[PDB]
């Protein structure tokens, strides 16, 4: 009875992986970029990148590596998805037609297994003899690369080492050999195994285990003539090869964790290393000659080159040019010069690519024109943190750098400004408190304020602090809606994290307030025990504290509710009234929660999203002054976001990248049955939704009606993808699903992945086919197939044009339908 439609408004922009090689031709240097479900293929030119082909996959690309078996004239591509779909792909071009051919495909999921902590790892031997996969603790899966293994059949080898950190195949070995770092009660260690195909087992490796740094975290397989392996830790870098052992502990790397690496020289003579502060280093391997013509490593050095965006991945292209693929900020092309500039940096940015992710909060505002909504998102993290302003006309994006992490956003029309919660990292100073690592919004405001309430900390106990502790400093920023200048910054208390934000009117009071919910955070507490609701008024360029309310917990969520304020505090939902004396007073409480993280409201009804008790339906009772529990979804779901679609339809998103929709149980004959919400819609989205919000970017056509879908809810995700959910009639749902099945018979899936499998609801507890959701992206894909294929799609299809009787559908009818659907976003 709930039928919904989901469509992409902005494809994911974060880069999860990037590799180079010779994929499109033996002579071309290609760049391949993974953006979750998308694979982008470029040719590297003297000036930059030429796009050649972009594909979507029915899966989250989890592994992407080029390789070239014997008899192939150019590299092949292995991809593994998060649902364990494995495939080998080949690039094919003839004329203007570009097709990605599937050479091999199969699902390598086990029936049982616990996904590993450091995630899926996939590696390929340098001689293309086999693929190795670390999917589950205690197991190593091997896919032999036989020409006949078009089904990608595999076998498992027991791993004694249950906690593997990283693993690579070594170069220069007559037998396939892995080198990996693992963790046990004795510490971290590095070990190797040879891989025997005959025995389908490991054999003893060529060199003995070594202890490594407690935080040894990455393995690099060094090519010939060096061979061997480099192990990267937080304070040290070591190289191992047989009886060779060389370690350095350069202090420069200790300030920020190196998290990615890339080979610069084909021979391994130089590597780049990037850290969490966006610093970029060169790692240089010094050779020592030997009388027998072998080469050994003479020394290792690290040199700071400069700063980039915080890199998820790095790829050297050619000619000193580097692609910096970022998931937390914009990606970049940068140039490396041999000589530094005035400030001592060898890095110069050449080009920037927008990244909206992570999208942590957002709101829709008609900033310039009535009816023309624009989205203002909290995007990014640490120095890449920003606001992004998105408007149609495909989309124009304005970037507002903040140089710190945004957390929440609201709009205050009456003050013509936004309130934004943000946090910055500071470290201990030489003699005093802490110092910021760079200027940022909270330190560059036109005016600034600090809290002075002394009730925040009770019975504080001094605790010894080790040197170099970083701290989070939280602030409320007041930002002009036109200029995006930092008008004001209010700094919160030490150890106080601001979690929730509202702008609203309360009671009979004509003033509009900024309201913030916080938590006091101490390292040894399993859950916060202290927090505040603080009511501020913005006037004359500054924030004044109007009122406070102390609670014994974290104020996760707040929402304006019928002129009163509803707030969630750990396992409680509490309703406050705003008094004539400008204080919050509790009217009523609801207690039957584990942790109430998410709230939305409509009328007197309340949808509560829990940490683990997924959705709840409460009613406020105005003639009783209390809450009534109406119903709950008794299926467990680990929520990341929720939304009220209407009085009868409730949208949830959960941590396994699925959406679901709940409804009241219409066939309930008892109060007990009426208390069970039914999950009537299910959909594997493949994205992590951080925020739902009502609104639309498409221009609204006033009195447009007799349209396919009704309502518009936008949502923002970790990957920077923006999507839209809307509601469907029964007839439209049925029409589009018939279309889906027919489309699914015609569209070629990259890797021969079934759409139904991809979109099937899937968690570690249950896997079920999708229901109640149409894949709008797929629907739109009707418009890009050839006309004979369109005619095939609509063959023997009964269709009701406008209002009337059903008849045979033509391609033009469905072209028109799909064109109308594409304009809703």
């Amino acid at each position: 009875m709930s039928y919904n439609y989901v469509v992409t408004a902005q494809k994911p922009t974060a880069v999860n992986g990037c590799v180079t090689g010779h994929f499109t031709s033996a002579e071309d240097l290609n760049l391949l970029i993974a953006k979750n479900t998308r694979l982008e293929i470029y040719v590297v030119t003297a000036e930059g990148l030429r796009p050649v082909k972009e594909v979507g996959m029915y899966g989250k690309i989890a592994v992407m590596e080029l390789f070239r078996p014997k008899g192939e004239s150019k590299d092949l591509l292995f991809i593994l998805t998060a649902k364990y779909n494995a495939c080998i792909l080949e690039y094919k071009q003839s004329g203007e037609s570009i097709d990605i051919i599937t050479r091999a495909h199969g699902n390598v999921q086990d029936r049982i297994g616990r996904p590993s902590e450091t995630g899926i790892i996939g590696i390929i031997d340098p001689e293309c003899r086999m693929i190795g996969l670390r999917l589950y603790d205690g197991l190593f899966k091997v896919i032999p690369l036989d020409r006949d293994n078009k089904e990608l059949k595999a076998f498992n080898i027991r791993l004694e080492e249950l906690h593997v950190i990283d693993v690579k195949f070594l170069y220069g070995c007559q037998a396939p050999t892995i080198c990996f770092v693992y963790q046990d009660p004795q510490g971290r260690h590095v070990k190797t195994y040879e891989v025997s195909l005959r025995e389908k087992e490991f054999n003893k490796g060529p060199w003995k285990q070594e202890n490594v740094e407690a935080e040894a975290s990455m393995v690099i397989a060094v090519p010939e003539p060096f061979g061997g392996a480099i192990i990267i830790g937080q304070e040290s870098i070591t190289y191992h090869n047989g009886d060779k052992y060389l370690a350095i502990a350069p202090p420069i790397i200790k300030q920020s964790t190196i998290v990615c690496h890339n080979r610069v020289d084909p021979n391994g003579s130089r590597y780049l290393l990037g850290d969490m502060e966006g610093r970029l280093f060169m790692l240089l391997l010094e050779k020592e000659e030997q009388m027998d013509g072998t080469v050994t490593l003479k020394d290792l050095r690290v040199e700071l080159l400069g700063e980039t965006s915080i890199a998820e991945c790095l790829t050297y292209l050619d000619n000193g040019v580097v692609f910096v693929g970022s998931r937390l900020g914009d990606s970049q092309l940068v140039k490396l010069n041999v000589d530094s500039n005035e400030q001592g940096s060898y890095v110069v940015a050449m080009e920037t690519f927008t990244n909206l992710g992570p999208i942590v909060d957002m709101c829709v505002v008609d900033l310039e024109r009535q009816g023309q909504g624009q989205l203002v998102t909290c995007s990014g993290a640490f120095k890449e943190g920003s606001l992004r302003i998105i408007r149609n006309g495909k989309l124009h994006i304005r970037t507002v750098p903040l140089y710190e992490s945004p957390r929440k956003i609201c709009y205050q029309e009456v003050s013509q400004c936004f309130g934004v919660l943000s946090s910055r990292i500071e470290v201990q100073d030489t003699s005093g408190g802490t110092t910021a690592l760079r200027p940022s919004a909270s330190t560059q405001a036109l005016s600034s304020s600090v809290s002075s309430s002394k009730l925040f900390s009770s019975s504080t106990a001094p605790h010894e602090t080790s040197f170099g502790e970083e701290v989070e400093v939280h602030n409320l920023l007041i930002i002009d809606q036109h200029t995006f200048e930092v008008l004001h910054a209010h700094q919160f208390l030490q150890n106080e994290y601001a979690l929730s934000l509202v702008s609203c009117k309360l009671g009979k009071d004509p003033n509009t307030y900024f309201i913030v919910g916080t938590a006091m955070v101490y390292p040894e507490e399993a859950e916060p025990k202290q927090g505040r609701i603080v009511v501020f008024q913005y006037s004359d360029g500054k924030l004044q504290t109007v009122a406070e309310k102390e609670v014994k917990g974290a104020v996760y969520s707040m929402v304006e509710f019928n002129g009163k304020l509803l707030a969630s505090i750990n396992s409680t939902v509490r309703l406050y009234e705003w008094t004539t004396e400008k204080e919050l007073r509790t009217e009523c409480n609801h207690y039957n929660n584990i942790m109430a993280l998410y709230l939305k409201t409509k009328g007197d009804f309340i949808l509560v999203g829990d940490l683990m008790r997924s959705v709840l339906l409460l009613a406020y009772k105005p003639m009783e002054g209390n809450f009534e529990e109406i119903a709950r979804d008794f299926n467990p779901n680990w929520m990341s976001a929720v939304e009220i679609l209407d009085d009868d339809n409730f949208l949830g998103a959960e941590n396994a990248f699925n959406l679901f929709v709940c409804q009241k149980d219409s066939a309930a004959t008892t109060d007990e049955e009426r208390q069970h919400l039914q999950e009537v819609g299910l959909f594997h989205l493949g994205e992590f939704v951080n925020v739902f919000c009502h609104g639309s970017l498409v221009m609204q056509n006033l009195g447009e009606t007799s349209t396919p879908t009704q309502g518009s809810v936008l949502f923002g995700t970790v990957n920077g993808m923006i999507g839209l959910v809307t509601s469907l009639s029964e007839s439209w749902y049925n029409l589009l699903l018939d279309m889906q099945n027919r489309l699914n018979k015609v569209i070629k899936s990259v890797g021969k992945i079934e759409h139904s499998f991809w979109r099937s609801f899937h968690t570690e507890r249950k896997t079920e086919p999708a229901t109640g959701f149409i894949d709008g992206d797929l629907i739109e894909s009707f418009l890009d197939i050839s006309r004979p294929k369109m005619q095939e799609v609509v063959a023997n299809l009964q269709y009701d044009d406008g209002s009337g009787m059903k008849r045979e559908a033509t391609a033009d009818d469905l072209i028109k339908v799909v064109e109308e659907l594409t304009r809703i976003h």
Partner: protein
């Protein structure tokens, strides 16, 4: 109560909002929050006594508060909370028809499957009306001990007091009743994730993993794990990868997917065997890697903790070591059973002549 590392609650929640932290690391810190609040389940909610001792237990899957429970004389009760409508009761012979296995009907929640000492594997209504028997000894001093059912596969299975095992469909269709063990079958259970490999426990100090569809050849089995003593139970995870096992003397064994034969870590614990006491059966959390067991102290046990009391302990699965303990005076019997909701918000316990409810505090 006191614990290893944790912090960064909303940091972690936000770092998941960033994609920084992994869901397992997330899920790890929320296991902790359950452990934290589980140290606040310390106030007991409800009790519900009746005639002869309890022998089995089962939750309503959809409903947190509704539960089915049976007796030592084959007397079933169906108790729900927040209702006050004096719950359902069915009586039996009272002496020799002891129910020993009990699982709801997935299709009709007001139905249920039952395994008794009478030797009548049955499906029955809470109003007493028997819909269908499923099997029978057809000869006295021979009865059933274990039972479980699937719904994704729609497959029924039961054990015996002799060591032969029986497997039915939801509508009869008997193709089974070969022998698997040499002595009584204590417990039996199927995989929820896959559908067509079985495990089974017996008095023979061995637990046996089967592949119901491929094997028909009288111990043409898949795996078989030996044990120092007989075993009361062996239960897959909800994840299906982590097969749990309980001895009869003092041990818990953790057999994972990866090479079923060798184990991961030994959780020694006193839950000692006895005739008139109901057999103890550890259990999983449906959504964490936690394990919950009732303690039956023994002076012979090499106790790590120096205070030895009958209670319920809370272990972590992949680690081995305890995390929380549930004690209540006015409950100074021994709980043989214990069964969190599939919800995981609430916990029921079965003591002889006493059923107990263990939910959180009312703030």
């Amino acid at each position: 109560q006191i614990l290893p590392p944790c912090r960064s609650i909303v940091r972690t929640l936000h770092q998941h909002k960033l994609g920084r932290a992994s869901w397992p690391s997330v899920q790890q810190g929320l296991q902790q929050s359950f452990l934290h609040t589980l140290d606040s389940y310390r106030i007991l909610q409800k009790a519900a006594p009746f005639d002869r001792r309890a022998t089995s237990l089962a939750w309503h899957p959809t409903h947190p508060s509704t539960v089915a429970v049976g007796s030592k004389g084959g007397d079933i009760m169906l108790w729900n909370f927040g209702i006050k409508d004096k719950p359902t009761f069915i009586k039996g012979i009272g002496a020799g028809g002891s129910i020993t296995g009990l699982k709801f009907n997935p299709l009709n929640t007001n139905q249920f499957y039952a395994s008794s000492m009478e030797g009548t594997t049955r499906l029955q209504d809470f109003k007493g009306n028997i819909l269908r028997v499923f099997a029978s000894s057809d000869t006295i001093n021979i009865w059933f001990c274990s039972l479980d059912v699937s719904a994704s596969s729609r497959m029924v299975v039961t054990g015996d007091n002799v060591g032969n095992v029986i497997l039915l469909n939801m509508d009869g269709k008997e193709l089974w009743n070969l022998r698997m063990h040499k002595k009584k079958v204590t417990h039996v259970a199927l995989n929820p994730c896959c559908d067509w490999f079985l495990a089974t426990a017996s008095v023979d100090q061995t637990v046996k993993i089967w592949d119901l569809r491929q094997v028909r050849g009288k111990a043409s089995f898949l795996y078989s794990l030996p044990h120092r003593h007989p075993v009361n139970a062996a239960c897959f995870s909800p994840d299906g990868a982590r097969l749990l096992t309980t001895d009869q003397k003092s041990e818990i064994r953790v057999y994972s997917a990866s090479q079923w034969d060798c184990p991961l870590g030994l959780i020694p614990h006193p839950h000692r065997h006895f005739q008139h006491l109901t057999p103890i059966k550890a259990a999983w959390h449906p959504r964490y890697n936690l394990i919950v067991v009732g303690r039956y102290p023994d002076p012979n046990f090499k106790s790590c903790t120096p205070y030895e009391l009958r209670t319920i302990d809370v272990f972590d699965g992949n680690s081995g070591k305890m995390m929380c303990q549930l004690y209540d005076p006015e409950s100074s019997g021994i709980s043989s059973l214990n069964e969190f909701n599939p919800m995981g918000d609430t916990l029921a316990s079965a003591m002889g002549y006493h059923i107990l409810i263990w939910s959180q505090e009312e703030a």
